[PDB]
Structure formats: C-alpha cells, structure tokens
Amino acid sequence: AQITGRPEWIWLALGTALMGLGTLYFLVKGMGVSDPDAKKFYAITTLVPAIAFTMYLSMLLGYGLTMVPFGGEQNPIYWARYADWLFTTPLLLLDLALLVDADQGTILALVGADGIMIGTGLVGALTKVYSYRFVWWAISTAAMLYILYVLFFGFTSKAESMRPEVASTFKVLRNVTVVLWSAYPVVWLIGSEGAGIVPLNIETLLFMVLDVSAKVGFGLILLRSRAIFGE
Amino acid sequence: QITGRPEWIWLALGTALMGLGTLYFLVKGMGVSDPDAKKFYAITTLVPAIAFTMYLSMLLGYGLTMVPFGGEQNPIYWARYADWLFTTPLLLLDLALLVDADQGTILALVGADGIMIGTGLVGALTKVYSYRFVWWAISTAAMLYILYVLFFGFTSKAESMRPEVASTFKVLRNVTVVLWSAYPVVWLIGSEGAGIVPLNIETLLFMVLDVSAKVGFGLILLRSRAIFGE
Amino acid sequence: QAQITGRPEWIWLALGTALMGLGTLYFLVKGMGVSDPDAKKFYAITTLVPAIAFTMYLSMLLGYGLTMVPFGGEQNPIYWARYADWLFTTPLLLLDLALLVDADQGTILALVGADGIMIGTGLVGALTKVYSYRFVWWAISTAAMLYILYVLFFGFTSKAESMRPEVASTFKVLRNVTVVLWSAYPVVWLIGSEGAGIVPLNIETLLFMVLDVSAKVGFGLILLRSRAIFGE
Ligand SMILES: O=S(=O)(O)O[C@H]1[C@@H](O)[C@@H](CO)O[C@@H](OC[C@H]2O[C@H](O[C@@H]3[C@@H](O)[C@H](O)[C@@H](CO)O[C@@H]3O)[C@@H](O)[C@@H](O)[C@@H]2O)[C@@H]1O
C-alpha cells in the first residue's frame, strides 16, 4: 500500500538536488547587496529553499517518513513536508507582504492563517479515522482560499499603486502562487494521503515539481527583478 | 480506552462557540480601514479560530492521549496546550498593543507565556505523579509574573493614554486576571492532577473559561475604541 | 560501547539546573528598576535564556527529557530536551548581539533562520536510527553554525567598529566568548554519546553543562554590566 521508502527515492533525491543547488545559487548571488530593503528579500528567499533542502534530505534518508493506520492498512506518510511548509509558506508570504508594503495587520492575519492551513493539514495527514481526514482537508483548503483571496483581490490593488516594476513583479508572482498553491489540495486529495486514486510515487513527484517551482522558481522571478527601491 | 466520550457535549459546544465566534469576528471586520484597528481584528480573530481547530481535534479524538501515571492510563487532552501555546501570547499582544507597551515587556511577556504553557504541557505528560506538581508550581509562578505586569504595570501606562484606552484595558485586565488565574485551580483539582474532579466536569470548566477568555474578551475589545480607529 | 542512562550525570544536570535558576533570579532581581526601553529589550532577552534553560535542565534531571534511540546495533540514551532549549535559546543570544550592533532586519532573519536549521538539523541527527546518517546531519548543522559565526566575526565586528567605543568593545568581548564556546558544541557532540563512542554520556553531559552555563549566564553578565545598551 503506497509502497514507500524506496520508489520515490529518485524524486526525493532530485528534490534535494534542486533545492540545494537553488540555495547555493541564491547564496553565491546575494554576495554583494547593500540595500537593507533588498537584503530582506534575499534573506527570506534563501531560507525557503534552504529549509526545504533539510526536509527533502530527511525524506530521502527515511527519517521524515512515518506509518499511520487508516482506511485498511499501514499507510506511509511523510510528515517532514509539513515540517518544511510550516515555516516555508509564511516566508513566501512575507516576501509578497514586503513587496507590496502590506499593513502589519494583514501580515499577521496572513501568517497565522498560514499556520492553520499547514497545521490542520498535518492533523488530517496523521488522523487515523479515514472519514475525518477530509474534515481537516476542507478546513485546510478554506484557510488557503482565504490567503489566496487577500493575495489576489487584496494585494493587487495595493500593488497597482506602487511602482510599475513592483505592480508588474507582484503580479507575475501572484499568478505563480495562486496557481501552484491551489494544486496542493488537489494532489493531497488524490494521493496516498486521502483517496488512493494516485500512488504515493506520483504524489511524491507532483509535490517535488510544485515545490521546486514554488520555491527556486518563485525565488528566481523575485530576485532577478527590481525588489522595491532595491536591487 | 474510552477517555473521550462523556465530555463530548462540552467539546462540541466548545467547538460550536469558537466557530461562530470566529465567523462573527470575520464577518464583522469586513470594512475596517485603520491599520491600527486592523491589528486588533487580526489578532482577535486568530485566537478563536485557533481554538476552533483545537477543540475539533479533541472532539474527534485526535487531541486526546493516554498518560501512564499512578498505576493507570490517564485521559490527557494535549490539544489544549497546542492551542494555548499560540492563543495566549495573542491575547497578551492585544493588551500590549492597546497600552502601547515597550518591545522589552512584550518579549518578556510572550517569552514568559511560552514557559507557562510549555511547562504545563510537560507537567501534563509527566509519568511520575509527584513531579507533575513541581511543573504546575513553575507554571503558576510564570502566570503570576505575567498577571503582575498586566496589573501592577500595564495599568499605570494605561492611565496615561486616553479615557477610552484606560477604561477598555481595565475591563479586559479585570477579565483576564480573573479568568486566567482559574486555570491552575481547575488543572490542580482536575484529571491532570488530584482526582478531586472528573475529566468530565473539568472539560466543562475549561470550555466555559475558554469561550469567555476568548469570545468574551474579544467582544469587549472589538466593540470599544481600539487605537487610532474603530 | 555505550548503553542506558538516567543517573550518573544526575549531578551535572542538578548543578546545571542550579546555576541556571540562580542566574535567572539574579537577572530578574537586577532588572528591577531599568526605565530605558533600549536596555529593557536586553534584560528581557538575557533573562529568558537562562529561564528557558532552567526548565530544560530540570526535565533532564527529572528523567522526562531523556529518551532511547536505536542505532549502531543497540538502544541509546539521548537528551532531546537540550535541543528544545537551544531551538529558542541560541537565537535569543543572536538577537542580543544583533540588537547591540543595530543589525539590519535582513541579517537578523538570515541569522535566526540559520540557527533554526542548526538546532533543528542537530536534533534530527541526534534521533537518526541509521548511524552513518547522523554525521551527515552533523556536517550540515556545523556548516550552518560556521555561517552564523562568520556574519558575527567578519560581519558584526565592522558594524560595531562604527558605533560607540563601548558598543564596539562590549560586542567584541561577547563575540570572543560566543565564537569560542559555540564552536565546542560540534566537538563535544561528535565525540559524545550522540556520535562516536570516544567519550561516555556522563562526561558529555558535563561538558555541555560547563558550556551552557558560561555561554548563557556568563555571556549574560558581560552584557548586562556594559551599559553600552543605552540604559541606566
Ligand atoms: O486510532 S484509534 O482512534 O482507533 O485509537 C488509538 C489507537 O488506534 C492507537 C494504536 O494504533 O493509535 C492512536 O493513534 C495514534 C496516535 O496519534 C497521535 O499521536 C501520533 C503518533 O502516534 C504518531 O507516531 C505521529 C506520526 O507518526 O503522529 C502523532 O504524534 C495521538 O493522538 C496519540 O495519542 C495516538 O496514540 C489511536 O488514537
């Protein structure tokens, strides 16, 4: 059942390679940088892939893998992803917050909501009672939908009042994040952690591609542009 | 290994009030332009929402665990500490922000609140019965330190802001010093310490203090003049 | 080879609980007055470090913070409670140092986060069942520390040598203390019960107790007596 600890190793190893090179890249590129504003963006955007490197290595080496009893058998679960996402997503949000110079009110309401989204997901991923896992999923999705709402119908208007570079950069990112983040509830749902439509194998591969691109990718769009009165 | 069955009604009622209290605070902060009042709404809404998630887990059994102390397995709801760990520092942040407290006292405060819950959690999961009280004492000492700065510290600075501020804070300060200090008493006499009171009534007690300490504290706050705006 | 524990190093943990608790009451019954908001931060940060450590030292004393990890072919005792402590403690020591040199929000985050990976990774290696892998995590955690010390040494110095002669002097002493005491942790752990068998858990608990007391209570003193915290 979702025979793990061996098939998806190549995906996990690959995810570790990209995330690590992606990190060494953003490290051996932030070298100069004087502007204190651009300093935040480089800091935030380098820890995201870095944290991920750590977590992908655990899954590859086994540690981040655990078994849960549900549906009818011993089910392989990678909790290490929620260890990653728990911190990683809020940093991704901080980048956009700092880029649109959002109010401290929305930043908190955003990070805290993000906390519930991952937290609730972790719960559902480890819940033993099958039916309930989807109660947590629904709650986690509602949390993401709220975050995506303020990013789309909230951070755009405030972005379209900054500089043409800012409004244009935020938008590309906003597009990449509303799309990449919304796929997560879908993969989770059809994967080893919900219905068994798709095997852990493909559930690892899909996450590894959405991850690299929601991180190394998102970071490339951001760090290569004019990061608000700094570059 | 029943553990979670009698107090289901309390937990479900607790999940109910925490859910509605949140939706209420969500479908109430709709407008709000002032960045200062924005903070208060953001802080005050996460508290009940966080508690919703945690009460649900207890009701669905997940937030329940068996601790082997005193020749037996014991029904311990760790989910309260998962809740409290984050929830309480937020209630204190509202207060800090209301009295425009220094970043020094905020950190000292939050830090201390972290020790309070963390220690309580440790005590609640300790196998050696005796020790559980050592941790309870250490936790109470931490609470006592917190309530001090809130009472004999945050008041003086509140009585120098505005008549709305000083009056609002005082009502909250009254509600928090009273509700917060009840917790160590319920824990001590409950299923987590001495068996004076069954897990049942305890779950009910916490559920009444939780709803008021959050949805109640929230209402008093979100109805008054919350800094630079409303 | 190694084997079960929970009693020889009771004294080291007791003494460690001891010093840490006193050091905290000392820093508490010393921050009594203090009106300056700038120095306020420093007292608030420097007080919690030992307070957190007291809690984590006591747990290791009362057995709670001890656990058994299977590896190398046999079960083994590990004190995870240190990592619980360090996770929150070390970054506060960095915050004190960042606030002193008035460091940029960019580097504070780049510092805290790196510290998170440093402890976190350490914890992971400490709990890894496959023996070979534990060193892979060690290597990584050390690389994280090394970075952290770099921005402190070859980074916070130059920004310090531009503040006030008090600041520049206070920071250098601390910098000297941290770079020296922090760099021992990877050495103790590598030779200790959580790595190779060179030295028993007994002495490894002792070593960390010496290093913890000084790196916190010692550091805390050098700092709260400098007034180069703009507070009097
Ligand atoms: O599942 S049942 O509701 O039917 O009753 C209990 C038993 O089935 C028991 C033995 O299988 O398992 C219990 O659920 C497992 C535990 O879940 C939570 O803790 C888990 C921990 O066990 C896992 O190791 C970890 C990931 O691998 O996730 C969590 O930390 C707690 O609720 C525990 O109390 C519980 O035993 C089940 O409740």
Ligand SMILES: O=S(=O)(O)O[C@H]1[C@@H](O)[C@@H](CO)O[C@@H](OC[C@H]2O[C@H](O[C@@H]3[C@@H](O)[C@H](O)[C@@H](CO)O[C@@H]3O)[C@@H](O)[C@@H](O)[C@@H]2O)[C@@H]1O
């Ligand atoms: O073999 S001994 O009897 O001599 O000692 C063992 C027993 O006392 C046994 C009793 O069940 O407990 C063993 O320690 C258990 C672990 O306790 C703590 O971890 C718990 C975790 O297991 C629980 O899931 C959770 C809530 O239920 O609380 C804690 O996190 C830690 O102290 C672990 O290190 C310890 O192994 C004891 O060794």
Ligand SMILES: CC(C)CCC[C@H](C)CCC[C@H](C)CCC[C@H](C)CCO
């Ligand atoms: C954010 C601060 C407050 C907490 C930091 C916590 C650390 C990142 C550790 C994260 C541990 C995760 C949530 C554990 C989930 C349950 C796993 C089965 C435990 C495996 O040890």
Ligand SMILES: CC(C)CCC[C@H](C)CCC[C@H](C)CCC[C@H](C)CCO
């Ligand atoms: C179940 C989940 C989706 C509930 C989500 C709750 C939200 C994260 C709470 C955030 C604060 C709410 C919106 C009330 C304050 C109103 C502010 C204008 C929000 C943005 O700062």
Ligand SMILES: CC(C)CCC[C@H](C)CCC[C@H](C)CCC[C@H](C)CCO
């Ligand atoms: C303000 C910031 C620091 C906190 C934001 C909100 C927090 C992340 C709270 C959300 C925590 C969720 C419910 C997860 C709790 C931990 C899980 C019960 C662990 C399961 O082992």
Ligand SMILES: CC(C)CCC[C@H](C)CCC[C@H](C)CCC[C@H](C)CCO
């Ligand atoms: C596994 C623990 C140590 C790490 C995760 C802790 C959470 C981030 C917040 C606090 C939750 C406490 C520590 C959980 C205690 C053990 C419970 C049986 C966990 C059930 O998920």
Ligand SMILES: CC(C)CCC[C@H](C)CCC[C@H](C)CCC[C@H](C)CCO
């Ligand atoms: C065991 C318990 C009581 C320890 C509590 C320790 C405190 C959280 C430490 C906070 C910092 C102390 C008060 C020193 C700074 C002095 C400030 C005037 C305190 C309020 O900001």
Ligand SMILES: CC(C)CCC[C@H](C)CCC[C@H](C)CCC[C@H](C)CCO
């Ligand atoms: C806001 C931040 C920087 C300061 C506050 C940090 C908190 C004081 C740290 C929490 C410490 C408590 C004692 C919890 C330690 C870990 C738990 C005892 C583990 C339970 O398995």
Ligand SMILES: CC(C)CCC[C@H](C)CCC[C@H](C)CCC[C@H](C)CCO
């Ligand atoms: C203080 C709040 C954030 C909860 C504590 C967060 C710490 C990361 C958790 C402390 C436990 C560390 C990580 C070790 C986990 C493994 C232990 C066997 C779990 C016993 O609780």
Ligand SMILES: CC(C)CCC[C@H](C)CCC[C@H](C)CCC[C@H](C)CCO
């Ligand atoms: C594996 C270890 C060495 C990776 C550590 C990476 C760091 C957390 C990243 C910090 C940001 C790097 C230095 C790139 C931005 C340059 C800035 C001057 C950093 C301080 O804001």
Ligand SMILES: CC(C)CCC[C@H](C)CCC[C@H](C)CCC[C@H](C)CCO
């Ligand atoms: C404040 C936030 C945003 C930044 C700091 C976050 C930390 C760097 C995140 C910690 C990541 C390390 C690898 C720990 C992951 C969780 C542990 C491996 C769980 C052990 O059971």
Ligand SMILES: CC(C)CCC[C@H](C)CCC[C@H](C)CCC[C@H](C)CCO
């Ligand atoms: C190999 C070198 C670079 C390691 C780092 C420096 C050394 C740890 C220096 C020792 C630092 C202070 C004196 C603490 C020593 C504590 C131990 C009892 C030392 C045992 O040799």
Ligand SMILES: OC[C@H]1O[C@@H](O)[C@H](O)[C@@H](O)[C@@H]1O
């Ligand atoms: O990740 C697989 C390989 O991809 C190549 O494009 C990189 O240059 C290598 O460094 C990497 O190992």
Ligand SMILES: CCCCCCCC
């Ligand atoms: C083969 C290593 C380079 C891959 C580039 C991927 C960019 C997201």
